[PDB]
Amino acid sequence: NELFQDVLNGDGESMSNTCTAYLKPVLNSITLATHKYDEYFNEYNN
Amino acid sequence: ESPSLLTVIIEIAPKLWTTFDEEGNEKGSIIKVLEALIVFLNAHLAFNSANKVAVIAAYSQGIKYLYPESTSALKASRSDLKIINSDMYRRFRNVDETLVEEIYKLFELEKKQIEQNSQRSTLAGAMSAGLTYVNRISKESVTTSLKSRLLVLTCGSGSSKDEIFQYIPIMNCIFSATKMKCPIDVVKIGGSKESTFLQQTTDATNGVYLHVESTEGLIQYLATAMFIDPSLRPIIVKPNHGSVDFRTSCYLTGRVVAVGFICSVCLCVLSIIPPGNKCPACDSQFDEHVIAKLKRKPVVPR
Amino acid sequence: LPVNKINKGFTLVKMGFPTRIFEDTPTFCSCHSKLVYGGYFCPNCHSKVCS
Amino acid sequence: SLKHSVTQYLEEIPQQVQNRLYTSPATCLAIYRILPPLAKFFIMAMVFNENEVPLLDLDKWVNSNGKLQFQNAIKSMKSLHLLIPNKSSGTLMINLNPTFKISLRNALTGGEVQNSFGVVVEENVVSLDLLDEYSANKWETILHFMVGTPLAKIPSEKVLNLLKHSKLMEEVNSTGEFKITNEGFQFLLQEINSQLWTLLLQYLKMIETSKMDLVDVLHFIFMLGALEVGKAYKIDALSETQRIMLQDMRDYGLVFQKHSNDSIFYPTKLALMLTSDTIPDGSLIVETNFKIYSYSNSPLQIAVLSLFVHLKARFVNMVLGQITRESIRRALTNGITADQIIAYLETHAHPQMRRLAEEKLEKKLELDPNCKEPLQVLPPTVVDQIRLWQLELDRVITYEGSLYSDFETSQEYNLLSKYAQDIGVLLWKDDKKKKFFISKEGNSQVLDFAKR
Amino acid sequence: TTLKVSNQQMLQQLSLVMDNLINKLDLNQVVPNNEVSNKINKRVITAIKINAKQAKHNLEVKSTLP
Ligand SMILES: [Zn+2]
Ligand SMILES: [Zn+2]
Ligand SMILES: [Zn+2]
């Protein structure tokens, strides 16, 4: 997210979408991993 | 540039086409698909002077070579029936007359053997026979550099569902066609939009998949998208929309498989751990220690 | 090679069947960290591979 | 080669004559078989739909790896007048030729074809025993006439005028013999299908009289390409112009007739070979001592080898000959270049010479892999000797024209020399000698420049 | 997992195909009426456009980023 806002206020959104889409699958995969972690944590809490 | 061989595998079944006629508004769609195929074969023979045509029909009780005729049948014959007009080009006329004569004979055989209803579709065996004929025309090598292309005109009509017995023969035909560089185009006439095995056949063998719902205007589909010659295959894009996922069905549940487990002995795909800790296909007993690790629940602190 | 009868390593092997992702924008693959248009997203963790 | 010649000839046809040529379905089918595969694919996808197809849609068909070829196909459809462009809604819409589309659809589906493919009369003879023998007999007759060997039977004056008025096969009446040109030995080089095509296009070039109609000749040639051997066809569908030119190719050998002006005519194998094609005889062994062991039994190969090989003995299998200086001088006095002779000796080379050359090149590559050499199937000594004899024929080249000199001022000489260079007729000039030379055809231009 | 025809109407449809093959197989009936051909052309061109936009582009490729 820091790199996304850095390219946002550096390149001014003309090239920030390309930077986001380049790292989009790894962001989605780590988001899915954190979601699975939180789901199993909440499952064991209950 | 280079002549090619067009081997046509048409699946004509009296039960399959009757369902399509009942679902559709029109009747006798066999005549429409046959005349569209005849015009398409005349178009292919017009493309080059040295191209060849093979037509094989898969009926309920087996398969039979529509064109060319059997060499015993050719030696036995010639009653020139007037199904096709005689004033056309003789190269087209011989192929068309032979094709319609063998349609006549095969439908007489179907009418004779209509009492027995077969639950075994012979489309995959017909594709295998077409591959053998393609190898023969390549192996015979009478003509330099003959190329080749399979075109399977099948019909589902919303009645015949997915056939799991066909899976291994269709995959073997895919590997054989990939080995001999023979593209496989498939035209499906019926209400079933998705045919997973035939879509995999078109995708893996660099063929074109085309599903249609009406037999009218079929020659407009064939001469436009199925007329991709093997000489011009890489320079023409393929309109085969609806990309297949290349997945497979589970063995004991039948559903399309997610992340799952297969038997290390017989490669059968299981969506879940089978009961009894034994493979349902090859009866191999699984170790209880290793499958507990698969059954082991993932870890996270409290 | 045909295996011996004494071999009892008949273990289930876990794998997933990925889907060929289609995109007109190049993305970093998880295996080589290079810009590849196509790929295969992992059915378990949604990570893409080249081959 | 073959498709390029008929493509360029059909380019020269006027557009109204081209559209009149699209009436018969057989002509349209034979023309369609000449087109490139992308062009054939676009035409075949475009016939069966009556609505016009945009050019941008056709551009989306082709992958990026063959787009240039697509343009070439379009160029062919921009040359043969099959695709009519239209400017509609800011788009370059493309429409198919209606007569061509209708005739091609009638050829494919069957129907009204006005007997463009003829009618079978069901009476037939053996093709190999008679029809192949008659066509080969006429072809060997005309070829043995044109190579210059003596013949007991000579072909008729219809083809003698054909050979006289052609660019090849020059004739002289002061001696009484026929001289082969460079184009003649070129004609002996390629395979017989494009030989027949070159003959037929030269015949098409000669036909301007009111006795003969050009469209009927093109229709008849294309249906002869469409006819099949081993089955006769009736003459009644043909016109009287078509009847007399049917007799003309009966003399030529493309078609067989049992008697003159018969009701039927038998197509030959040359008719089907007119469309497309499909150790050997004439295979030769060249040695360092210039001995030719040419495994030929047909008189055609022996006769064409006699143009440049001093034949010594004849066996059933080969003809024992030798490449001498005098025989090569005989070949070069007929204008047959050394490159044509070397190409002929390369194309008819023995498989054993090919194996020896392959072994030599295999020893060469394992010795010097830094450079690659062409597969010299025949020894380089005889090639060098052939080129040396070619050089000693042309040690002097004679240009006839006029030399202008004796200029008192250098400026006038410079002006005349630069004028001659601008009109492209000067060959040599020198201000030190004050002389400049011009060719024979460029004399009169400088004459009217100087007089006026 | 995520209308069976009787043999009588089966034979009637087969005999209908038989008599439609006896009388005249007019191949010129394959020509569309220029209305369905428009729909077929639109479907094929849309599929071609989708596949060509997908397969326009497919050592890593060059990027617009510095
Ligand atoms: Zn198993
Ligand atoms: Zn990678
Ligand atoms: Zn993964």
Side-chain angles (χ1 to χ4, degrees):
Chain A
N1 300 352
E2 280 153 7
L3 182 56
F4 295 154
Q5 59 93 9
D6 277 340
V7 71
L8 264 167
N9 59 8
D11 286 333
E13 177 54 31
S14 71
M15 294 177 70
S16 305
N17 57 4
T18 63
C19 175
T20 312
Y22 276 18
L23 312 175
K24 179 182 177 302
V26 61
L27 177 58
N28 285 122
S29 191
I30 65 188
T31 312
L32 175 65
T34 50
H35 286 182
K36 288 181 64 177
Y37 185 87
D38 295 334
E39 279 170 9
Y40 275 103
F41 176 60
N42 296 336
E43 178 179 352
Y44 292 167
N45 287 339
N46 307 335
Chain B
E1 183 176 5
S2 59
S4 63
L5 164 67
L6 175 58
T7 299
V8 171
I9 306 304
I10 186 167
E11 184 183 10
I12 61 170
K15 44 168 300 181
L16 282 180
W17 288 112
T18 311
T19 45
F20 179 73
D21 292 4
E22 290 291 329
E23 288 288 332
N25 51 86
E26 83 287 337
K27 303 296 164 291
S29 300
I30 298 169
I31 293 292
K32 314 300 168 299
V33 62
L34 196 66
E35 64 177 354
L37 174 57
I38 285 168
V39 178
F40 183 64
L41 292 181
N42 294 333
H44 172 262
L45 287 168
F47 186 84
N48 191 278
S49 301
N51 45 27
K52 297 183 178 180
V53 167
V55 186
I56 295 98
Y59 55 96
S60 59
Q61 307 297 138
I63 61 179
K64 139 174 172 175
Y65 270 72
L66 293 186
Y67 182 80
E69 269 174 0
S70 172
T71 70
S72 57
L74 295 174
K75 183 178 179 180
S77 64
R78 312 188 181 271
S79 60
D80 189 15
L81 197 43
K82 292 313 169 63
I83 301 179
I84 317 295
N85 50 71
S86 58
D87 54 343
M88 71 184 327
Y89 190 31
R90 288 300 304 177
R91 283 189 68 254
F92 302 150
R93 179 55 152 80
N94 297 355
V95 183
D96 297 358
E97 178 72 19
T98 304
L99 188 137
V100 300
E101 165 184 355
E102 296 304 312
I103 300 299
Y104 205 90
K105 284 180 173 54
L106 190 149
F107 283 166
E108 286 278 354
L109 193 142
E110 283 184 351
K111 170 181 178 182
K112 184 64 63 184
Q113 184 62 255
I114 197 66
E115 55 92 20
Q116 167 58 224
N117 304 119
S118 168
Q119 286 78 27
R120 187 73 54 181
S121 173
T122 61
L123 183 60
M127 293 177 70
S128 305
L131 282 171
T132 60
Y133 189 87
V134 159
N135 184 221
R136 164 207 185 177
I137 299 304
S138 160
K139 269 187 79 284
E140 183 178 2
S141 83
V142 290
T143 70
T144 59
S145 191
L146 177 63
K147 299 296 183 181
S148 58
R149 179 167 99 261
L150 289 171
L151 170 70
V152 179
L153 311 178
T154 179
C155 51
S157 72
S159 58
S160 60
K161 286 301 180 179
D162 194 14
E163 305 292 332
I164 51 176
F165 71 94
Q166 298 178 357
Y167 168 74
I168 298 103
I170 300 299
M171 295 299 103
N172 291 354
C173 289
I174 286 173
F175 298 137
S176 172
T178 313
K179 172 65 181 302
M180 64 183 73
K181 303 187 302 176
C182 172
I184 302 183
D185 294 331
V186 169
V187 167
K188 186 181 183 62
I189 305 168
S192 181
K193 172 65 179 60
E194 303 288 332
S195 183
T196 60
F197 293 158
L198 278 296
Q199 277 171 289
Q200 284 185 75
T201 316
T202 51
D203 211 328
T205 61
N206 205 28
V208 189
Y209 182 80
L210 175 59
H211 169 256
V212 294
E213 65 271 58
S214 300
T215 182
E216 55 91 19
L218 189 51
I219 188 56
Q220 182 61 219
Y221 271 115
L222 299 182
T224 308
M226 311 295 98
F227 208 63
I228 306 178
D229 202 78
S231 180
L232 57 87
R233 276 275 160 177
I235 58 180
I236 296 298
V237 304
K238 303 176 299 300
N240 47 350
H241 79 284
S243 173
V244 68
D245 45 1
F246 276 108
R247 289 172 177 267
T248 179
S249 62
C250 167
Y251 192 86
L252 73 164
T253 66
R255 59 185 59 182
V256 63
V257 69
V259 292
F261 321 99
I262 66 169
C263 177
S264 60
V265 180
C266 71
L267 307 176
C268 78
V269 191
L270 315 175
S271 55
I272 51 179
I273 294 92
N277 299 324
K278 193 175 57 183
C279 169
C282 75
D283 307 324
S284 300
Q285 179 63 39
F286 298 145
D287 183 26
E288 292 86 9
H289 173 37
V290 57
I291 62 183
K293 305 307 183 62
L294 306 180
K295 277 290 196 59
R296 194 153 64 178
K297 203 75 167 182
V299 285
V300 64
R302 305 291 83 79
Chain C
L1 306 182
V3 302
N4 206 327
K5 194 184 303 299
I6 58 179
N7 291 319
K8 312 300 293 179
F10 306 147
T11 80
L12 282 171
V13 189
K14 182 177 181 180
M15 72 291 291
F17 292 83
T19 55
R20 181 171 52 186
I21 192 58
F22 283 163
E23 186 75 280
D24 49 351
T25 301
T27 52
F28 282 98
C29 61
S30 299
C31 56
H32 304 89
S33 299
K34 59 191 300 179
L35 277 300
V36 183
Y37 271 45
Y40 303 94
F41 268 58
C42 174
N44 167 259
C45 75
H46 294 174
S47 49
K48 61 171 303 180
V49 296
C50 294
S51 175
Chain D
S1 300
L2 189 149
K3 308 298 189 304
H4 292 73
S5 57
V6 290
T7 309
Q8 286 296 325
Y9 181 75
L10 287 180
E11 166 65 30
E12 294 282 341
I13 303 300
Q15 185 162 355
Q16 59 275 2
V17 191
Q18 212 164 11
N19 296 330
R20 194 174 59 178
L21 212 67
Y22 292 151
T23 55
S24 49
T27 291
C28 290
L29 173 58
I31 279 177
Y32 164 74
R33 289 180 180 177
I34 313 298
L35 317 178
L38 294 174
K40 289 188 299 176
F41 171 75
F42 283 129
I43 286 304
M44 192 47 39
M46 184 177 177
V47 170
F48 294 105
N49 47 331
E50 324 298 321
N51 52 352
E52 49 194 0
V53 183
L55 190 141
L56 275 298
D57 291 9
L58 302 183
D59 197 19
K60 292 290 185 177
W61 277 98
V62 192
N63 207 334
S64 61
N65 292 318
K67 281 297 200 305
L68 188 142
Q69 321 178 13
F70 163 68
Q71 317 294 331
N72 308 352
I74 291 303
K75 185 172 75 174
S76 187
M77 299 324 88
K78 223 159 193 175
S79 70
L80 190 65
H81 302 151
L82 288 185
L83 296 189
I84 295 92
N86 186 272
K87 184 57 170 50
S88 294
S89 74
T91 60
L92 191 57
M93 185 64 72
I94 300 300
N95 189 24
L96 197 40
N97 181 275
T99 310
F100 176 75
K101 175 169 59 182
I102 285 301
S103 54
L104 197 52
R105 185 179 307 171
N106 293 328
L108 287 181
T109 62
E112 176 60 85
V113 293
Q114 59 270 3
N115 301 333
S116 61
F117 307 100
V119 294
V120 180
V121 293
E122 176 66 22
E123 60 185 0
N124 47 355
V125 296
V126 178
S127 61
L128 177 60
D129 194 14
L130 182 52
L131 308 188
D132 188 25
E133 202 271 332
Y134 190 78
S135 59
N137 190 17
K138 292 299 189 177
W139 196 239
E140 281 151 352
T141 300
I142 185 54
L143 269 294
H144 288 116
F145 179 79
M146 65 179 288
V147 299
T149 187
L151 286 177
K153 178 62 175 58
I154 53 179
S156 61
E157 73 272 5
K158 304 302 177 60
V159 70
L160 308 194
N161 176 269
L162 183 139
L163 290 178
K164 172 60 184 175
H165 289 354
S166 70
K167 293 179 179 179
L168 73 165
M169 192 76 267
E170 57 186 350
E171 195 268 337
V172 62
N173 267 320
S174 73
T175 310
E177 55 92 19
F178 321 98
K179 306 183 304 306
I180 309 105
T181 78
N182 189 58
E183 314 291 331
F185 192 83
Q186 184 58 43
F187 181 85
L188 276 296
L189 187 60
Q190 76 257 10
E191 209 264 330
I192 63 178
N193 48 7
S194 63
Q195 292 173 354
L196 283 170
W197 271 128
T198 45
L199 212 69
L200 284 186
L201 281 71
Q202 205 271 331
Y203 179 79
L204 281 158
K205 289 188 59 57
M206 294 183 286
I207 61 170
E208 312 304 314
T209 60
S210 65
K211 302 297 186 303
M212 186 64 72
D213 199 6
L214 177 73
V215 286
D216 301 338
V217 180
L218 291 169
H219 294 322
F220 196 78
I221 283 182
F222 287 143
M223 61 79 71
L224 272 189
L227 293 190
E228 52 189 353
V229 76
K231 263 175 290 183
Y233 291 84
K234 203 152 46 178
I235 198 167
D236 65 335
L238 321 178
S239 66
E240 61 86 20
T241 82
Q242 291 194 0
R243 277 186 285 272
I244 58 186
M245 61 80 72
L246 174 71
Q247 299 295 321
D248 169 77
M249 283 74 74
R250 199 263 308 266
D251 205 349
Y252 281 7
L254 295 186
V255 64
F256 172 75
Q257 218 178 31
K258 188 181 180 182
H259 307 105
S260 61
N261 291 318
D262 264 0
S263 300
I264 73 182
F265 56 94
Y266 285 86
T268 67
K269 296 189 62 59
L270 306 182
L272 61 83
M273 291 205 268
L274 188 63
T275 56
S276 60
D277 195 13
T278 303
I279 71 178
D281 296 351
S283 174
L284 51 82
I285 300 171
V286 185
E287 314 277 10
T288 57
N289 48 11
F290 296 84
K291 298 302 179 301
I292 308 303
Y293 311 97
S294 61
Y295 288 76
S296 164
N297 46 357
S298 66
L300 192 139
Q301 299 156 336
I302 310 175
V304 69
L305 276 157
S306 176
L307 259 60
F308 52 89
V309 167
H310 172 269
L311 307 180
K312 313 178 68 176
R314 181 185 175 190
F315 276 80
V316 188
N317 290 139
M318 62 225 77
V319 175
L320 295 175
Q322 189 182 5
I323 292 186
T324 60
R325 181 187 177 272
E326 47 265 13
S327 66
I328 300 303
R329 282 296 302 277
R330 286 190 295 105
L332 276 295
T333 50
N334 307 349
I336 305 176
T337 66
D339 293 325
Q340 289 186 348
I341 304 180
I342 291 157
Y344 180 87
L345 271 291
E346 278 162 341
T347 47
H348 291 65
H350 208 273
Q352 302 293 331
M353 261 196 298
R354 189 77 58 176
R355 294 159 72 259
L356 190 137
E358 279 175 6
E359 290 168 351
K360 185 173 57 184
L361 189 148
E362 281 290 332
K363 298 303 169 297
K364 160 75 179 181
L365 59 90
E366 71 190 28
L367 192 142
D368 195 8
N370 308 277
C371 65
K372 301 302 175 297
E373 309 293 327
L375 191 60
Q376 302 182 3
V377 61
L378 77 166
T381 306
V382 302
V383 177
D384 291 344
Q385 198 50 62
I386 292 312
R387 299 186 188 278
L388 275 187
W389 286 328
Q390 163 85 70
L391 289 187
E392 66 182 2
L393 181 70
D394 294 359
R395 290 186 62 91
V396 298
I397 47 173
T398 76
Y399 299 111
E400 190 276 331
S402 56
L403 179 73
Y404 286 161
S405 64
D406 204 8
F407 294 99
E408 289 86 9
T409 61
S410 175
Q411 286 294 328
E412 181 186 6
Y413 170 77
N414 290 329
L415 191 142
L416 271 295
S417 64
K418 72 171 51 60
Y419 166 75
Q421 186 67 31
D422 285 4
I423 67 183
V425 305
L426 187 153
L427 301 187
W428 173 86
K429 54 164 292 183
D430 193 16
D431 201 15
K432 299 296 297 179
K433 216 59 174 298
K434 212 74 64 179
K435 306 182 174 296
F436 77 96
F437 182 82
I438 55 177
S439 56
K440 169 65 180 60
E441 54 94 21
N443 287 329
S444 300
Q445 308 177 6
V446 182
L447 288 169
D448 62 65
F449 176 74
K451 283 295 183 178
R452 305 166 192 176
Chain E
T1 49
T2 181
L3 299 177
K4 305 177 182 178
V5 294
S6 80
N7 282 14
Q8 313 304 316
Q9 61 179 356
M10 208 156 155
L11 196 48
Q12 295 298 139
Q13 195 264 354
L14 282 176
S15 302
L16 169 65
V17 176
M18 291 305 337
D19 58 63
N20 200 17
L21 199 65
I22 292 296
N23 48 7
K24 173 64 64 179
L25 188 55
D26 188 18
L27 277 297
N28 203 26
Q29 304 295 326
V30 307
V31 182
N33 46 26
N34 208 14
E35 189 265 328
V36 287
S37 85
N38 306 332
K39 182 254 291 179
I40 296 173
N41 286 169
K42 287 154 192 166
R43 176 160 182 260
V44 170
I45 295 299
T46 44
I48 283 159
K49 283 184 179 180
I50 290 302
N51 293 25
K53 195 62 181 181
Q54 178 50 49
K56 188 155 61 66
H57 308 279
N58 53 2
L59 177 59
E60 61 178 1
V61 300
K62 297 191 59 56
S63 172
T64 70
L65 276 80

PDB file of all heavy atoms in Angstrom, chain B residues 262-268 279-284 286, ligand 1:
ATOM      1  N   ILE B 262      -5.123 -37.695  -5.664  1.00  0.00           N
ATOM      2  CA  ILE B 262      -5.207 -38.765  -6.645  1.00  0.00           C
ATOM      3  C   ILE B 262      -4.477 -39.982  -6.098  1.00  0.00           C
ATOM      4  O   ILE B 262      -3.604 -39.885  -5.233  1.00  0.00           O
ATOM      5  CB  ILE B 262      -4.627 -38.380  -8.019  1.00  0.00           C
ATOM      6  CG1 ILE B 262      -3.124 -38.156  -7.911  1.00  0.00           C
ATOM      7  CG2 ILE B 262      -5.313 -37.138  -8.563  1.00  0.00           C
ATOM      8  CD1 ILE B 262      -2.431 -38.034  -9.236  1.00  0.00           C
ATOM      9  N   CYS B 263      -4.853 -41.144  -6.620  1.00  0.00           N
ATOM     10  CA  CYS B 263      -4.152 -42.371  -6.279  1.00  0.00           C
ATOM     11  C   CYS B 263      -2.797 -42.393  -6.973  1.00  0.00           C
ATOM     12  O   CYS B 263      -2.697 -42.109  -8.169  1.00  0.00           O
ATOM     13  CB  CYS B 263      -4.982 -43.585  -6.688  1.00  0.00           C
ATOM     14  SG  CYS B 263      -4.166 -45.160  -6.403  1.00  0.00           S
ATOM     15  N   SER B 264      -1.749 -42.725  -6.221  1.00  0.00           N
ATOM     16  CA  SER B 264      -0.414 -42.787  -6.801  1.00  0.00           C
ATOM     17  C   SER B 264      -0.217 -44.000  -7.697  1.00  0.00           C
ATOM     18  O   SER B 264       0.772 -44.048  -8.437  1.00  0.00           O
ATOM     19  CB  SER B 264       0.640 -42.789  -5.694  1.00  0.00           C
ATOM     20  OG  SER B 264       0.477 -43.905  -4.838  1.00  0.00           O
ATOM     21  N   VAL B 265      -1.122 -44.972  -7.653  1.00  0.00           N
ATOM     22  CA  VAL B 265      -0.988 -46.184  -8.451  1.00  0.00           C
ATOM     23  C   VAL B 265      -1.682 -46.045  -9.798  1.00  0.00           C
ATOM     24  O   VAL B 265      -1.088 -46.316 -10.844  1.00  0.00           O
ATOM     25  CB  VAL B 265      -1.537 -47.389  -7.661  1.00  0.00           C
ATOM     26  CG1 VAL B 265      -1.409 -48.659  -8.477  1.00  0.00           C
ATOM     27  CG2 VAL B 265      -0.819 -47.522  -6.332  1.00  0.00           C
ATOM     28  N   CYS B 266      -2.943 -45.618  -9.796  1.00  0.00           N
ATOM     29  CA  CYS B 266      -3.761 -45.616 -10.999  1.00  0.00           C
ATOM     30  C   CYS B 266      -4.181 -44.229 -11.461  1.00  0.00           C
ATOM     31  O   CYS B 266      -4.948 -44.129 -12.426  1.00  0.00           O
ATOM     32  CB  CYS B 266      -5.015 -46.470 -10.781  1.00  0.00           C
ATOM     33  SG  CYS B 266      -6.194 -45.718  -9.652  1.00  0.00           S
ATOM     34  N   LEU B 267      -3.735 -43.169 -10.781  1.00  0.00           N
ATOM     35  CA  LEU B 267      -3.943 -41.770 -11.168  1.00  0.00           C
ATOM     36  C   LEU B 267      -5.414 -41.366 -11.214  1.00  0.00           C
ATOM     37  O   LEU B 267      -5.762 -40.372 -11.858  1.00  0.00           O
ATOM     38  CB  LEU B 267      -3.276 -41.452 -12.512  1.00  0.00           C
ATOM     39  CG  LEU B 267      -1.800 -41.808 -12.661  1.00  0.00           C
ATOM     40  CD1 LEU B 267      -1.338 -41.505 -14.077  1.00  0.00           C
ATOM     41  CD2 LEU B 267      -0.964 -41.053 -11.643  1.00  0.00           C
ATOM     42  N   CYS B 268      -6.298 -42.106 -10.549  1.00  0.00           N
ATOM     43  CA  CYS B 268      -7.701 -41.720 -10.502  1.00  0.00           C
ATOM     44  C   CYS B 268      -7.877 -40.540  -9.555  1.00  0.00           C
ATOM     45  O   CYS B 268      -7.236 -40.466  -8.505  1.00  0.00           O
ATOM     46  CB  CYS B 268      -8.576 -42.902 -10.078  1.00  0.00           C
ATOM     47  SG  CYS B 268      -8.610 -43.296  -8.312  1.00  0.00           S
ATOM     48  N   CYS B 279      -8.218 -47.285  -2.448  1.00  0.00           N
ATOM     49  CA  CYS B 279      -8.549 -46.653  -3.719  1.00  0.00           C
ATOM     50  C   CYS B 279      -9.786 -47.306  -4.323  1.00  0.00           C
ATOM     51  O   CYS B 279      -9.858 -48.537  -4.394  1.00  0.00           O
ATOM     52  CB  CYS B 279      -7.380 -46.757  -4.691  1.00  0.00           C
ATOM     53  SG  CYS B 279      -7.807 -46.280  -6.372  1.00  0.00           S
ATOM     54  N   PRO B 280     -10.779 -46.526  -4.758  1.00  0.00           N
ATOM     55  CA  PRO B 280     -11.971 -47.134  -5.370  1.00  0.00           C
ATOM     56  C   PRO B 280     -11.719 -47.730  -6.742  1.00  0.00           C
ATOM     57  O   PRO B 280     -12.534 -48.540  -7.202  1.00  0.00           O
ATOM     58  CB  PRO B 280     -12.959 -45.963  -5.448  1.00  0.00           C
ATOM     59  CG  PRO B 280     -12.094 -44.752  -5.496  1.00  0.00           C
ATOM     60  CD  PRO B 280     -10.893 -45.062  -4.651  1.00  0.00           C
ATOM     61  N   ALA B 281     -10.626 -47.365  -7.412  1.00  0.00           N
ATOM     62  CA  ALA B 281     -10.363 -47.819  -8.773  1.00  0.00           C
ATOM     63  C   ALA B 281      -9.477 -49.061  -8.812  1.00  0.00           C
ATOM     64  O   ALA B 281      -9.884 -50.099  -9.339  1.00  0.00           O
ATOM     65  CB  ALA B 281      -9.732 -46.684  -9.589  1.00  0.00           C
ATOM     66  N   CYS B 282      -8.267 -48.972  -8.265  1.00  0.00           N
ATOM     67  CA  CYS B 282      -7.305 -50.063  -8.342  1.00  0.00           C
ATOM     68  C   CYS B 282      -7.178 -50.851  -7.045  1.00  0.00           C
ATOM     69  O   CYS B 282      -6.313 -51.732  -6.962  1.00  0.00           O
ATOM     70  CB  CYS B 282      -5.933 -49.526  -8.757  1.00  0.00           C
ATOM     71  SG  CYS B 282      -5.050 -48.656  -7.455  1.00  0.00           S
ATOM     72  N   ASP B 283      -8.007 -50.546  -6.040  1.00  0.00           N
ATOM     73  CA  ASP B 283      -8.080 -51.282  -4.771  1.00  0.00           C
ATOM     74  C   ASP B 283      -6.747 -51.304  -4.025  1.00  0.00           C
ATOM     75  O   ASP B 283      -6.402 -52.299  -3.384  1.00  0.00           O
ATOM     76  CB  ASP B 283      -8.594 -52.710  -4.979  1.00  0.00           C
ATOM     77  CG  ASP B 283      -9.900 -52.753  -5.743  1.00  0.00           C
ATOM     78  OD1 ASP B 283     -10.739 -51.850  -5.541  1.00  0.00           O
ATOM     79  OD2 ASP B 283     -10.085 -53.689  -6.548  1.00  0.00           O
ATOM     80  N   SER B 284      -5.988 -50.216  -4.099  1.00  0.00           N
ATOM     81  CA  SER B 284      -4.733 -50.124  -3.366  1.00  0.00           C
ATOM     82  C   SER B 284      -4.988 -49.567  -1.972  1.00  0.00           C
ATOM     83  O   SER B 284      -5.604 -48.508  -1.820  1.00  0.00           O
ATOM     84  CB  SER B 284      -3.735 -49.243  -4.114  1.00  0.00           C
ATOM     85  OG  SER B 284      -3.462 -49.767  -5.402  1.00  0.00           O
ATOM     86  N   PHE B 286      -4.286 -47.615   1.266  1.00  0.00           N
ATOM     87  CA  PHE B 286      -3.498 -46.445   1.612  1.00  0.00           C
ATOM     88  C   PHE B 286      -2.963 -46.563   3.031  1.00  0.00           C
ATOM     89  O   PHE B 286      -3.599 -47.149   3.911  1.00  0.00           O
ATOM     90  CB  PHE B 286      -4.333 -45.170   1.480  1.00  0.00           C
ATOM     91  CG  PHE B 286      -4.830 -44.911   0.089  1.00  0.00           C
ATOM     92  CD1 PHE B 286      -6.071 -44.332  -0.120  1.00  0.00           C
ATOM     93  CD2 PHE B 286      -4.059 -45.247  -1.011  1.00  0.00           C
ATOM     94  CE1 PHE B 286      -6.533 -44.092  -1.399  1.00  0.00           C
ATOM     95  CE2 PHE B 286      -4.515 -45.009  -2.294  1.00  0.00           C
ATOM     96  CZ  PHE B 286      -5.753 -44.431  -2.486  1.00  0.00           C
TER      97      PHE B 286
HETATM   98 ZN    ZN F   1      -5.775 -46.446  -7.483  1.00  0.00          ZN
END
